[PDB]
Amino acid sequence: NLLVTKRDGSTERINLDKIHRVLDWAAEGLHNVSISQVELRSHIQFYDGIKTSDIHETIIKAAADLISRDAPDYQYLAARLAIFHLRKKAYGQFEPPALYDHVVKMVEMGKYDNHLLEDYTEEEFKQMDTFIDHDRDMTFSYAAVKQLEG
Amino acid sequence: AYTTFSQTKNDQLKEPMFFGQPVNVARYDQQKYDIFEKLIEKQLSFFWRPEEVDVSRDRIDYQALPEHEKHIFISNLKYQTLLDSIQGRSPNVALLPLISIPELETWVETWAFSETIHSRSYTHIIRNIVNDPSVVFDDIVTNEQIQKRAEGISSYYDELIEMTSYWHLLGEGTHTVNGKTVTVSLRELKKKLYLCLMSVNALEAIRFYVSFACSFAFAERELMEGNAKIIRLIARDEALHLTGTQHMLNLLRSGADDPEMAEIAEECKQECYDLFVQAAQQEKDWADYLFRDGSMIGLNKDILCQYVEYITNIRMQAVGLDLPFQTRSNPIPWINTWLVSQIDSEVDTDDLSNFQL
Amino acid sequence: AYTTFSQTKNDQLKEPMFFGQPVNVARYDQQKYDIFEKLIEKQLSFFWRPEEVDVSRDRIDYQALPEHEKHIFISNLKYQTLLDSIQGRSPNVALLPLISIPELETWVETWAFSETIHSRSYTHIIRNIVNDPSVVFDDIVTNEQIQKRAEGISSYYDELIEMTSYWHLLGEGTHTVNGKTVTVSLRELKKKLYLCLMSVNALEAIRFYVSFACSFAFAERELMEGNAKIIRLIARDEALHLTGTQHMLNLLRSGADDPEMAEIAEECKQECYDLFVQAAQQEKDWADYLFRDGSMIGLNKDILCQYVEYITNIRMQAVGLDLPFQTRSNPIPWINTWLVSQIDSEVDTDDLSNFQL
Ligand SMILES: Nc1ncnc2c1ncn2[C@H]1C[C@H](O)[C@@H](COP(=O)(O)OP(=O)(O)OP(=O)(O)O)O1
Ligand SMILES: Nc1ncnc2c1ncn2[C@H]1C[C@H](O)[C@@H](COP(=O)(O)OP(=O)(O)OP(=O)(O)O)O1
Numbered sequence: 001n002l003l004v005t006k007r008d009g010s011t012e013r014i015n016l017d018k019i020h021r022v023l024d025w026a027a028e029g030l031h032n033v034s035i036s037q038v039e040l041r042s043h044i045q046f047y048d049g050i051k052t053s054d055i056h057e058t059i060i061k062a063a064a065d066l067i068s069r070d071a072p073d074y075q076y077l078a079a080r081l082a083i084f085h086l087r088k089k090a091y092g093q094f095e096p097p098a099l100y101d102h103v104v105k106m107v108e109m110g111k112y113d114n115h116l117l118e119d120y121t122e123e124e125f126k127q128m129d130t131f132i133d134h135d136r137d138m139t140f141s142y143a144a145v146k147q148l149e150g
Numbered sequence: 151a152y153t154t155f156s157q158t159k160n161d162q163l164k165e166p167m168f169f170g171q172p173v174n175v176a177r178y179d180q181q182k183y184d185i186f187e188k189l190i191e192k193q194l195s196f197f198w199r200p201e202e203v204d205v206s207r208d209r210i211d212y213q214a215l216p217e218h219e220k221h222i223f224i225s226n227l228k229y230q231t232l233l234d235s236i237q238g239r240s241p242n243v244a245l246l247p248l249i250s251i252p253e254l255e256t257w258v259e260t261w262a263f264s265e266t267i268h269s270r271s272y273t274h275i276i277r278n279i280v281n282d283p284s285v286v287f288d289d290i291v292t293n294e295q296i297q298k299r300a301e302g303i304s305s306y307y308d309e310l311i312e313m314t315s316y317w318h319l320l321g322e323g324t325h326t327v328n329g330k331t332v333t334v335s336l337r338e339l340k341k342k343l344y345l346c347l348m349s350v351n352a353l354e355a356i357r358f359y360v361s362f363a364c365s366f367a368f369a370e371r372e373l374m375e376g377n378a379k380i381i382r383l384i385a386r387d388e389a390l391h392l393t394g395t396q397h398m399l400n401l402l403r404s405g406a407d408d409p410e411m412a413e414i415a416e417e418c419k420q421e422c423y424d425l426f427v428q429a430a431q432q433e434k435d436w437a438d439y440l441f442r443d444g445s446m447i448g449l450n451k452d453i454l455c456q457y458v459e460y461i462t463n464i465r466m467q468a469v470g471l472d473l474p475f476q477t478r479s480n481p482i483p484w485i486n487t488w489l490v491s492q493i494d495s496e497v498d499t500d501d502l503s504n505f506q507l
Numbered sequence: 508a509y510t511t512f513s514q515t516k517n518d519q520l521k522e523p524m525f526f527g528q529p530v531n532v533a534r535y536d537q538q539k540y541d542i543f544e545k546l547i548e549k550q551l552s553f554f555w556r557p558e559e560v561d562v563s564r565d566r567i568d569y570q571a572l573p574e575h576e577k578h579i580f581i582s583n584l585k586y587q588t589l590l591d592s593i594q595g596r597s598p599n600v601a602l603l604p605l606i607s608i609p610e611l612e613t614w615v616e617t618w619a620f621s622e623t624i625h626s627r628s629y630t631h632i633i634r635n636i637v638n639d640p641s642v643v644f645d646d647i648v649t650n651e652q653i654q655k656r657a658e659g660i661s662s663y664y665d666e667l668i669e670m671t672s673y674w675h676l677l678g679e680g681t682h683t684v685n686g687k688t689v690t691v692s693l694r695e696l697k698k699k700l701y702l703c704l705m706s707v708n709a710l711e712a713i714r715f716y717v718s719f720a721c722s723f724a725f726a727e728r729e730l731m732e733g734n735a736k737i738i739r740l741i742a743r744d745e746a747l748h749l750t751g752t753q754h755m756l757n758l759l760r761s762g763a764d765d766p767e768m769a770e771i772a773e774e775c776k777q778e779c780y781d782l783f784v785q786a787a788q789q790e791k792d793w794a795d796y797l798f799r800d801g802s803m804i805g806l807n808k809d810i811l812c813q814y815v816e817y818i819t820n821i822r823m824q825a826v827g828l829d830l831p832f833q834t835r836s837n838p839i840p841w842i843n844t845w846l847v848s849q850i851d852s853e854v855d856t857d858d859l860s861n862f863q864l
């Protein structure tokens with residue numbers, strides 16, 4: 001009967017199936033990992049109004065510390081969980097925006113260099129968006145992803 | 151005819167495990183198969199009482215559980231009470247009249263006794279988490295999801311006890327009992343024993359360990375920890391129990407004890423395989439019932455069903471049966487923690503001088 | 508037909524001790540007769556192991572004994588091994604299919620289990636005083652002076668086990684089994700149960716206590732004290748055991764549990780009297796064999812036979828049987844210690860003046 005606080009501020013009833021779905025996705029294709037281990041090692045302390053973004057960061061830490069010689073594939077489970085969390089932090093969703101739409105907003109915010117818009121045209125930016133393979137974020141290890149966001 | 155003290159002086163070391171001369175003198179200075187003497191010594195060393203465990207804090211944890219998790223916990227407790235209720239009396243009733251070596255006789259009696267401690271501890275746990283224990287106990291016999299497997303498990307025991315009575319009352323041969331013809335085959339009795347032990351092995355090595363997953367999954371959340379200490383003690387005995395049945399089954403299957411038995415064990419291989427597969431399917435269905443109203447952190451239908459397939463392959467391999475499920479890594483690795491216990495500053499310039507930069 | 512888990516949901520508090528519905532669920536939150544629940548709790552608290560007792564000094568004392576005292580000790584030990592060999596398996600085999608309330612079922616298995624500890628302690632003592640235990644054990648079955656008394660006790664068990672199998676396989680009624688007619692009477696089965704419990708009561712409360720006198724007579728002379736330490740623990744259990752059979756017998760005899768049984772108990776009253784009297788004569792006969800080659804300080808044929816008659820009157824009176832021997836004071840009172848745990852210088856001249864010499 002308790003409520004979790006979603007990323008957009010709204011709330012809904014706590015559903016552990018949401019957590020099972022995320023972990024089953026992150027453990028897909030991996031060998032010798034355990035959804036149950038990640039949930040139990042999280043020691044996640046629920047309370048009414050718990051932020052859903054803090055919940056996810058907990059299971060990333062838990063899966064990251066399970067990296068061992070006997071279970072080396074946790075380096076990919078924790079990485080896939082970390083990429084997922086990092087997509088939401090920057091975009092609010094999973095799919096990244098277009099390369100042009102992003103550079104426009106970022107140069108406008110002063111976070112990117114001004115020359116990106118001057119030296120490349122929108123037709124050129126869309127052509128490089130076809131080069132991008134956003135599925136290559138699924139080939140990182142957890143140590144790589146933490147150095148990326150860090 | 152069974153006798154509590156057989157008059158014949160038999161060399162107990164040459165008797166078989168079953169169907170030989172009834173044990174007369176109970177001596178423990180020598181053994182034919184010393185595996186059972188070790189099981190006795192180890193079970194006697196594990197002696198524990200339920201009251202010596204603090205379970206008072208568990209009531210707080212139980213009442214704070216979600217409504218469907220009270221059900222998950224209390225259903226696994228009703229099922230546990232039923233299995234170890236059967237296991238309290240059955241090895242004594244079903245095996246003692248057949249045993250013919252003293253070490254196996256005494257082990258079965260120690261095995262059975264240790265099961266009554268489990269039954270007493272379930273009364274201990276129940277009396278400390280629920281308000282009216284009668285609510286839990288009265289549901290055990292009528293429960294639909296339980297009584298299906300309850301009557302199936304007890305049947306292997308009941309049938310072995312019945313054939314044993316005919317074999318003792320009438321002996322081997324074709325008999326007539328009130329008109330109807332009754333055939334008493336020792337080979338058919340040896341077949342009902344082997345099937346029973348197989349059913350008991352699946353009962354204690356698969357059915358209970360699926361239950362262990364439920365009890366210990368709550369403990370990984372630091373909930374029901376008084377229960378977890380008792381279930382941990384039970385799990386330590388349960389490892390001794392299934393080891394006993396494994397050695398019995400393998401000694402019968404390998405024909406070391408009875409040349410006839412090695413052949414009979416092969417005639418049952420398909421029936422025994424179906425026996426284990428049915429047990430594994432029954433527990434997966436039981437898992438489907440536990441999580442019908444929701445799951446919990448670390449355990450759902452998938453996780454528990456994966457452990458059913460995982461532990462079944464392990465148990466069936468130990469008794470020489472074909473693996474019915476795909477190879478799989480342990481889906482709940484956390485359960486294993488519950489089932490097993492300056493500068494040497496001296497310089498030598500001459501040695502350094504032997505150098506060319 | 509016996510079932511290890513009866514399908515009927517029955518109020519166990521209203522079932523009789525025996526011959527009711529076979530126990531299904533094993534619960535201990537309630538009892539019909541709480542005497543058996545207390546006996547379980549008390550037996551579990553007395554749990555001891557033989558190896559935790561120092562018996563190393565006993566080999567030296569034994570080898571230093573006179574030859575006829577070696578005979579007394581080792582004969583009383585062989586007889587002890589024989590009796591508790593029967594007692595290890597018999598309560599489990601003969602009573603478990605008949606019991607219909609859970610507290611009595613668990614007590615019988617606990618009772619039996621504690622007897623296997625006795626059987627193991629006899630092996631412990633034997634293996635630590637003699638050089639080849641095989642010589643001691645093999646003589647238990649072959650010695651004609653010993654095995655004679657074995658068949659008297661085992662018969663009451665064997666006959667109850669046989670009638671029980673017929674009552675389960677055929678049910679009550681007149682049957683024909685391979686031509687010959689076989690009548691199964693529940694009243695005759697209740698009669699074989701009551702007679703059996705009477706035989707066990709005389710075994711554990713008279714026969715063994717005669718043996719206790721021998722073990723403790725060596726201890727009063729500070730000899731075989733490691734044996735005496737174990738026998739004292741065994742006697743502490745034996746006091747619980749005979750209390751169980753007394754309570755069963757008295758509940759059956761008064762008809763509080765089963766009115767039909769009050770009738771049957773009266774039809775056996777003469778058989779029970781002769782049963783107890785015979786046991787005393789057999790133990791007096793056994794005493795003649797112990798001292799066939801001589802006596803020792805504090806114990807001879809006369810002394811031990813007086814204790815047989817002394818202890819028999821007490822036991823028979825406890826179950827409503829007539830006293831067969833003359834009244835006598837305890838001939839060995841030392842055994843009871845083993846079978847239980849400035850002058851006030853002030854003067855008043857005025858008071859003295861108020862005087863008349
Ligand atoms: N109802 C819920 N109760 C508990 N945990 C939840 C719930 N829904 C999602 N989670 C968990 C699963 C994820 O591992 C973690 C992050 O979820 P995520 O889907 O990124 O948050 P969200 O659903 O609030 O944002 P978005 O709108 O982007 O989906 O939160
Ligand atoms: N092809 C895929 N790529 C990435 N993630 C996937 C894919 N298929 C399934 N998933 C997983 C990732 C998420 O954990 C889950 C869906 O994420 P999300 O939109 O957050 O749903 P949710 O369970 O949080 O519901 P909601 O967001 O509506 O509350 O499914």
Ligand SMILES: [Mg+2]
Nearest residue numbers: 006007018052
């Ligand atoms: Mg979401």
